[PDB]
Design a protein around this ligand. Structure first.
Ligand SMILES: *SCC1=CC(C)(C)N(O)C1(C)C
Ligand SMILES: [Cl-]
Ligand SMILES: [Cl-]
Ligand SMILES: [Cl-]
Length: 164
């Protein structure tokens, strides 16, 4: 198991424009196109992201290319962020994947806002971090995914993903 397989499970794969859990236009493996209500604005972002006239449909190769770029960007965003980098540096390889997962889903700014949870993770207080992470809109809006990510932080294993 690794970060790519992990996010593929959490995000799924769809080759036509769709609305994510928040109702935002998205495509591929959780690639957010726009927060704008307009399907035309989304198709225009998609064409720009892909580099051709897509008409809202992409191939699997194209979805996987956006995915590679998105995972890379999330990692580089953690490493350049002053609140995230020290947490990331403190963690083992499995829990690092959990942090990347959160950043991929909510962005660098959102995760940097979990000030108290980040401090507990850095201190390696795993049960206490898990309880604090669950006191969040994130957990309340997407409970099954949040539970998988939180269990990964708690245990340092891939158990929440292995029967999937
Ligand atoms: S978040 C810690 C916690 C409190 C209580 C309601 C007693 N629980 O069942 C858990 C362990 C979730
Ligand atoms: Cl998704
Ligand atoms: Cl892009
Ligand atoms: Cl969920």
């Amino acid at each position: 198991m690794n970060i790519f397989e992990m996010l593929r499970i959490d995000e799924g794969l769809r080759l036509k424009i769709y609305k994510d859990t928040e109702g935002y236009y998205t495509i591929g493996i959780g690639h957010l196109l726009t927060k704008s209500p307009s399907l035309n604005a989304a198709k225009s972002e998609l064409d720009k992201a892909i580099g051709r006239n897509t008409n809202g449909v992409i191939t699997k190769d194209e979805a996987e290319k956006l995915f590679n770029q998105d995972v890379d960007a999330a990692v580089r965003g953690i490493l350049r962020n002053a609140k995230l980098k020290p947490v990331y540096d403190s963690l083992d390889a499995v829990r690092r994947a959990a942090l990347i997962n959160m950043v991929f889903q909510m962005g660098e700014t959102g995760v940097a806002g979990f000030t108290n949870s980040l401090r507990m993770l850095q201190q390696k207080r795993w049960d206490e971090a898990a309880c604090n992470l669950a006191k969040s809109r994130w957990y309340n809006q997407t409970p099954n995914r949040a539970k998988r990510v939180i269990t990964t932080f708690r245990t340092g294993t891939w158990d929440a993903y292995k029967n999937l």
